Design a protein around this ligand. Structure first.
Ligand SMILES: *[C@@H]1O[C@H](CO)[C@@H](O[C@@H]2O[C@H](CO)[C@@H](O)[C@H](O)[C@H]2NC(C)=O)[C@H](O)[C@H]1NC(C)=O
Ligand code: NAG
Ligand code: NAG
Ligand code: NAG
Lengths: 148, 126, 188, 315
């Protein structure tokens, strides 16, 4: 029942808006009258140079939030939406004990048991699927170059 | 790919719009003469002025000058568009009429149209 | 003949010289040996970084982007918004939504590494199989379809560039001609 | 039946050949990872994209047009002032002005107003330069290569009933396929319209598209893309890239419990993540296939001008 959902700030998928009065979300609409279904998440301002420590519950919404709403409509469970500590995916970087490369980030918080499910459009590659199981890819998306 | 050289002036081009302009200036002359009879050598002069509007090189038109100015502006914008698309037809008429190198996927499964061959018992064939 | 040459020359200015001004072919080795003006970056600790480190020819791009590691992609958005960047490898539809936001941010046509994005999961769990079944149930209906119709499909060379300075200069010439008309009427 | 009858009934181990991914096949056996983005699409006959717009005023002169009429009325009022200073230019300056814009053999008068002659000369030079710029802008509008679509959705208005549209269209698939099961999972009425337009095979429908005996054909995306890259004359081109579709993929279905499955999935990840799959796509695809009169709308505007002249004619 308790599903600690972790997420990173994705610019089209995870919109993080501060609460209006006290822990509340504004019932904003889309371009066709459909109201925006936000959720209560726990997020900081920035990383450690940005803010020293200021993590508040705000309103997270976008795409994957309504996707998890569709999941909870589908299957009988509850959840717990929170954010990721850093602003990284989490790679196999070295730990200071005689150059031993381990994982961090979203993978480092998932394998620590602090997280439960990473609802994020991560690039499925070899070695991350070598260690944990993934889901089937909902999004079919490539890579390209942005210019001016 | 060497195609010899009418550039689609009237006979390859579709021949509806010239009859449309002829019938349209006929309707123009009909409503000009309804304006003439219901006026709030004149007939031949008004006909020749209706030709002279299109000639691109004036009777009493107290409300007919609006008709003449709309017809003249329409005629010049139509012939300007015709100049534009004839130049467009003759400039951008370069299609892909070759093989484009040895790495052509279209000749991997050819037909009896792209007839390519080589010298009998050549080293290029080897 | 002179003004016909002028009309055809004004037609000739807008003929497409400079069709594309960069090296957007990904296999072109000008990016393998870049310059100071080729500011291309990546997000720090990205999966694209692992994809580049996995191969053997991505050395110079890795050495350039390790001097250009970004915390977030919004840092890259602000940098290319301030024209500090020149290229960035990113997912297609997100940059399509950003091109719908701001038209200056333009993608390229070469779609490379057609990847799949799923959900980060644990190991063998009863909340994996029904989850994948619900994902496939989302696939079979138009749920991702109309959620793309909400904002992904929803976006948000004329006579207008060559008129403004023309209008100002012609209006100034008209006012100056009227002033000269006042002078010539004052002469007679 | 088929590969499903061979693998689920354990007469075959796996199907290393390509296979569509849908609900019930994922229910009976477990696929591999989707190694290629292969959704579904519809091959059409031809978009018939001709570079001619129906309108020529509002897509071209919208913000220029207001300032042009403002400067036109200013020059005409100045000509009225000069004609009243020192033999028909009381209110008829506008027809003379916009007839000397084009110079279509309009005999008006011999101007003795010197200010009128100077303003006509300046406005005539201005008329020459915006006529040149408008011809240049018509060339610039020709420069891009666009194509007008007709069916822009799976919920298209044609798909309700072809009795509303004067050409009746046509579309069909092959029997005993997963495409029919996917359509029946979408619309029973679509199967009702498709059952009367059934056909035999893929290349038979291709020949029907070549000869013009078929309009639409529902199939997978990348196979139709490969067939369109080898199309003769570059006519059979699909609309879009599966944007209005379910956007499935291809996988390798193994028996549920096969120990080879993880090694196959990691080998597919290794084949994708090094350009070797990109090498195979270069070896087995093609992308060289890149991207005259639509008049009488301004004739409808001409008929509206005739109606307004008939309105002003009676009084
Ligand atoms: C980012 O963190 C800072 C620091 O905790 C927050 O700044 C505080 O804001 C409140 C409300 O204006 C003030 O009463 C405090 O005095 C501020 N503290 C300091 C030390 O600056 C800030 O609210 C956070 N950003 C947001 C808007 O969430
Ligand atoms: C969900 O689970 C609870 C557990 O007590 C059960 O009682 C309830 O019937 C279920 N409801 C739904 C919506 O399936
Ligand atoms: C941690 O690793 C760093 C790498 O530079 C190195 O200084 C040392 O081996 C470790 N500890 C310290 C003292 O930083
Ligand atoms: C899947 O389906 C139902 C509802 O989610 C659940 O009770 C059952 O235990 C699940 N079993 C599997 C195959 O995960």
């Amino acid at each position: 029942t308790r599903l600690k959902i972790v997420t990173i700030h994705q610019e089209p998928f995870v919109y993080v808006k501060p609460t209006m009065s006290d822990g509340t979300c504004k019932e904003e609409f889309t371009v066709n009258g459909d109201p925006v279904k936000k959720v209560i998440c726990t997020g900081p301002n920035d990383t450690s140079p940005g803010s020293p420590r200021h993590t508040v519950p705000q309103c997270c919404y976008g795409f994957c939030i309504d996707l998890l709403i569709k999941l909870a409509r589908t299957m009988n469970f509850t959840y717990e939406v929170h954010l990721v500590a850093d602003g990284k995916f989490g790679t196999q970087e070295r730990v200071n004990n005689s150059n031993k490369k381990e994982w961090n980030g979203m993978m480092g918080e998932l394998l620590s048991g602090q997280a439960d499910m990473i609802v994020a459009p991560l690039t499925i590659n070899n070695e991350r699927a070598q260690y944990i199981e993934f889901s089937k890819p909902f999004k079919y998306q490539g890579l390209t170059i942005l210019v001016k | 790919k060497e195609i010899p050289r009418l550039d689609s002036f009237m006979q390859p081009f579709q021949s509806t719009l010239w009859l449309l302009v002829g019938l349209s200036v006929h309707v123009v002359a009909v409503m000009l003469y309804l304006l003439d009879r219901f006026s709030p050598l004149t007939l031949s002069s008004a006909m020749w002025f209706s030709w002279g509007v299109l000639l691109n090189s004036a009777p009493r038109s107290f409300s007919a000058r609006i008709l003449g100015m709309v017809w003249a502006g329409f005629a010049m914008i139509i012939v300007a568009s015709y100049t534009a698309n004839l130049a467009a037809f003759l400039v951008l008429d370069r299609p892909e009429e070759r093989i484009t190198g040895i790495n052509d996927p279209r000749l991997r499964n050819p037909s009896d149209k792209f007839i390519y061959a080589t010298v009998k018992q050549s080293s290029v064939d080897i | 003949i002179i003004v016909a040459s002028y009309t055809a020359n004004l037609a000739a200015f807008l003929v497409l010289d400079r069709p594309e001004e960069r090296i957007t072919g990904i296999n072109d080795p000008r990016l393998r040996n870049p310059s100071d003006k080729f500011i291309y970056a990546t997000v720090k600790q990205s999966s694209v970084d692992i994809y580049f480190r996995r191969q053997v020819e991505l050395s110079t791009m890795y050495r350039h982007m390790e001097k250009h590691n970004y915390e977030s992609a919004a840092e890259a958005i602000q940098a290319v918004r301030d024209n500090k960047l020149h290229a960035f490898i990113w997912d297609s539809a997100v940059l399509e939504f950003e091109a719908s936001q701001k038209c200056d941010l333009v993608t390229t046509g070469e779609l490379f590494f057609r990847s799949g994005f799923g959900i980060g999961m644990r190991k063998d769990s009863p909340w994996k199989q029904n989850v994948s079944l619900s994902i496939l149930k989302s696939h079979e209906n138009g749920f991702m379809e109309d959620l793309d119709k909400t904002w992904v499909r929803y976006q948000e060379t004329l006579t207008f560039e060559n008129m403004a300075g023309v209008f100002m200069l012609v209006a100034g010439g008209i006012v100056a001609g009227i002033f000269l008309i006042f002078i010539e009427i004052a002469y007679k | 039946n088929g590969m499903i009858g061979e693998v689920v009934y354990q007469r075959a181990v796996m199907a290393v050949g390509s296979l569509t991914i849908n609900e019930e096949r994922s229910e009976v056996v477990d696929f591999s990872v989707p190694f290629v983005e292969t959704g579904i699409s519809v091959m059409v006959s031809r978009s018939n994209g001709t570079v001619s717009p129906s309108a020529f005023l509002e897509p071209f002169s919208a913000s220029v047009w207001v300032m042009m009429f403002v400067m036109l009325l200013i020059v005409s009022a100045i000509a009225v002032f000069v004609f009243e200073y020192f033999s028909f230019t009381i209110g008829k300056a506008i027809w003379l002005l916009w007839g000397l814009v084009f110079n279509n053999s309009v005999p008006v008068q011999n101007p003795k107003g010197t200010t009128s002659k100077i303003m006509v000369s300046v406005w005539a030079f201005f008329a020459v330069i915006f006529l040149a710029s408008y011809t240049a802008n018509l060339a610039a509008f020709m420069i891009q290569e666009e194509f007008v679509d007709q069916v822009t959705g799976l919920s298209d208005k044609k798909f309700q009933r072809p009795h509303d549209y004067s050409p009746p269209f046509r579309f069909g698939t092959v029997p005993a396929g997963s495409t029919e099961r996917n359509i029946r999972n979408n619309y029973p009425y679509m199967h009702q319209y498709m059952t009367r337009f059934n056909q035999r095979g893929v290349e038979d429908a291709l020949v029907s598209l070549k000869t013009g005996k078929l309009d639409a054909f529902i199939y997978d995306a990348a196979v139709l893309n490969y067939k369109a890259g080898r199309d003769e004359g570059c006519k059979l081109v699909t609309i879009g890239s599966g944007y209005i579709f379910a956007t499935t993929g291809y996988g390798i279905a193994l028996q549920k419990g096969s120990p080879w499955k993880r090694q196959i999935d990691l080998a597919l990840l290794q084949f994708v993540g090094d350009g070797e799959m990109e090498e195979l796509e270069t070896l087995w695809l093609t992308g060289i296939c890149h991207n005259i009169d639509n008049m009488a709308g301004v004739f409808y505007m001409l008929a509206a001008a005739m109606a307004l002249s008939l309105i002003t004619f009676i009084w």
